[PDB]
Amino acid sequence: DHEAHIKVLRGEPTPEEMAALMAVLASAGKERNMWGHPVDKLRYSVFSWQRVTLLERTHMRR
Amino acid sequence: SKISKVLVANRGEIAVRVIRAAKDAGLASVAVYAEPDADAPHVRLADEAFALGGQTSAESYLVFEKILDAAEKSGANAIHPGYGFLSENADFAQAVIDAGLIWIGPSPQSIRDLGDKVTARHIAARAKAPLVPGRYLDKPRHVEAQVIADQHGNVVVAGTRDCSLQRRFQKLVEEAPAPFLTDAQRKEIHESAKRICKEAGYYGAGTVEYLVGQDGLISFLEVNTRLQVEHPVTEETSGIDLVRQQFKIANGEPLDITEDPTPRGHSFEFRINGEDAGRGFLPAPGPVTKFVAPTGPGVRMDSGVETGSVIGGQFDSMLAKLIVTGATREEALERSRRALAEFTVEGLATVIPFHRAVVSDPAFIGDGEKFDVHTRWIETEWNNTVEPFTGGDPIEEEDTVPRQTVVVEVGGRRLEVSLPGDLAIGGAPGVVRKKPKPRKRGGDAVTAPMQGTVVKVAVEEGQEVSAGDLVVVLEAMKMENPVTAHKDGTITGLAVEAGAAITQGTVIAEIK
Amino acid sequence: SKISKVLVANRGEIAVRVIRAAKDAGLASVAVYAEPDADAPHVRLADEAFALGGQTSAESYLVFEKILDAAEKSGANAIHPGYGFLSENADFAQAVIDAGLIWIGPSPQSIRDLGDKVTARHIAARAKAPLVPRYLDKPRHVEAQVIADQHGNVVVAGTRDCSLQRRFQKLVEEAPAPFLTDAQRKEIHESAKRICKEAGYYGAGTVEYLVGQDGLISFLEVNTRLQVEHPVTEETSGIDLVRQQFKIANGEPLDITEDPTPRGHSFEFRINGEDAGRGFLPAPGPVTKFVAPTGPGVRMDSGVETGSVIGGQFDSMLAKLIVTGATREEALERSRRALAEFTVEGLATVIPFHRAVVSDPAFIGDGEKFDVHTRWIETEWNNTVEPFVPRQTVVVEVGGRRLEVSLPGDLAIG
Known about the structure:
GO molecular function (chain A): acetyl-CoA carboxylase activity; propionyl-CoA carboxylase activity
Radius of gyration of chain B: 26 Å
Strand order of the largest sheet of chain B: 10-9-6-7-8-11-18-16
Structural class of chain B: alpha+beta
Protein name (chain A): Acetyl-/propionyl-coenzyme A carboxylase AccE5
Keywords (chain C): ATP-binding, Biotin, Fatty acid biosynthesis, Fatty acid metabolism, Ligase, Lipid biosynthesis, Lipid metabolism, Magnesium, Manganese, Metal-binding, Nucleotide-binding
Helix content of chain B: 10-25%
Organism (chain A): Mycolicibacterium smegmatis (strain ATCC 700084 / mc(2)155) (Mycobacterium smegmatis)
Distance between the termini of chain B: 64 Å
Number of helices of chain A: 3
Number of strands of chain B: 29
Largest interface: B-C, 52 and 57 residues
Strand content of chain B: 25-35%
Oligomer: part of a larger assembly
Domain ATP-grasp (chain C): 121-250
Largest sheet of chain B: 8 strands, antiparallel
Shape of chain A: rod-shaped
Helix content of chain A: 40-55%
């Protein structure tokens, strides 16, 4: 077991206080669509390395 | 002549203590500091402080000329040596008296006479101290008589201390008055100490150490010729301020106290060493990232360190001393069980968990007529349940998850609750948790396993060594640390020399 | 009938002192805190702690309902008052007895009878206490520490001098009361015994007297509590007065048969958060730094630490500095050290006043007498001190109980 458990560091709640505490704590708390992605709206020089390191990288990263 | 300005030729807690005694006397106090101590409390607490300009205990504190030069420049008219360092160096005491400063301590001659073991044996003989017959002992107790001795030869026995908790030859917990002794044993220890000190011509503060067998036979051990570390329990059990007494005697004023004070109450001292009891009390450097002293009823605490202090490998591990006192030994133990539970130190390993245990261990509580403790008890009989110090390091996979600590009120109960940052109860960009590796490596290079100084170089360049041969002895924390050849070969490079400071990971030599 | 778990009904220095005494006895210590104190040292040091709520004493520590309720919720078996608050409220003491908790204090009838000067004065006359015949011009205030017994034994732990006072508020305290003649001392001791035995007093309390320049003693008052300046008597006599309160509340006869001879001398200096440069008005604010004086001959009992905030909602007192020595002059010397080491930052304190008075010939004396009187700080001391987010709550029902629950409103998780 290596989950990060809740710790009560100080004091000792009796069972009913434990249950009230836990119940209140329990109460509170990738579809790609590149269409018109900003990187497509940018305008790149024909020899711009950003065509590799920004545009293509952004499209390919999945 | 009259003392007016005292140079406190020492560091840490005893420096603090002598500064405070000076201020109570209304004397001026001059501290000295090595470069690791430039931020130390006592440099600020003293009325003045002078830099010894040295990286290590030898070049900073122990060279006589730097302390005498500090005395000159400050115009200090007396020197108090504290304990250790030069407090036992009779040649330094002589050089001080040659300079004409009031040496606050015993005469150089009596320091030599009681320092030489054979000469001291002859002294104890003439004195007719209770020497042991001759005889090997099984499980002796250790009992100290505090001596206050006038320059005029008046002597009082301020009381007794039991110091049987010693690990390897270094006292860790002490108590006053020495419990569980017959009045005949008290009579013997007292009047033997009187006789012994005047047969030595002694004056000043002093202490005679006795070693008491399970047969009850007292034996003399030696006279320490200086103020003890444990003196505070004698101050908390006798109406005496021993450092001010020592000032008076160095003034040559007579003893105001004519007869042995009646021991009243019981007082324990616990040495708060920067040593991990969970790893055999090996001392280690580190910051004091938090210090919070016990306070209040029946508590005293003397510390050389504060929050944000740094402790390095150059000096003794003792951070502070806790004294706890009460009307009865049982009451004093109860108060100890409070104070040691209130004590929190953070940032480095400390023996506080050992103190917490031993003050709760039946072997030390005793049956009401004797206890079981003896000089080897910690080394051989104490059940060491203390887990090794790991500080704040994450060491298991679950530790790596950040936590938020909150205060919760539940029916009026106050709870402290630590909640994981990702807690799922009630319902990541590829994050992974796994057990972190510790910071530990594992060639030809022999490398220094810790920072320290090179006390001995065991080899010469071109020497053939085999695996397991000694290469150097490092001192760290005033503690010997052999470093040995990991494989056979010719010693080459050998970049160290004796007395050099050495940082962790430094190449000592390389074996080819 | 035997104490097992003590609710400490008060805050601050006495809260800590009783928590510590309880831990020494090995009793379970339960603290209560109002909203301003929700992380105070006593709240974190106590073995258990309960929120009273409310922003003021009238909303909190004084509400009989809340304190008895907290005692129930804790399952306490005894209630210990400090000084102040309900420590001398006879009606509350009775309410506690009705609750059947061990009230670690004097019996309600004694509190009631001694709380009326008329009834109390009658009692004093019946006891043949030394009584004022005139007005004392410049009296010296001296009191005796009683440790009575449910079996009617009484021990007088000592005389204590409190003559450095302002607005009838004490500022510096001494034990044993200095420069008293032996005749005065005997009169005071035997009178404290007579008067409290006539009063039927169960346990710990202070009998207070005025002494004039002629050295005649007059009885002043009996205060039916372990008064705040008890530590000087503790350090002089070695009686752990709080643990004596525990024994007396148990109804155990005293271990002490005869008045303990004082070992030496001790002073107490109240570290009030009051600026003598503005004439001792409160100075609310942060305690941004609190370095306690430390080591030989010095004890600190404190209700504040670095980062505490102080407000007028409660009394100005922050700590007691206690200094002990073999002699008056030695103890004054040690105090002149300790008060110099004591460093507070971020709010004004009487510390400069203490540094002055421990340096002042009127308080040093000449070796046979000294000049301080209960008004001397006012009438005669040359004052030279230079002037210096919310909580969410949820009310839950659980099968046996209602439980209100409170969380930081900024709580977020997962």
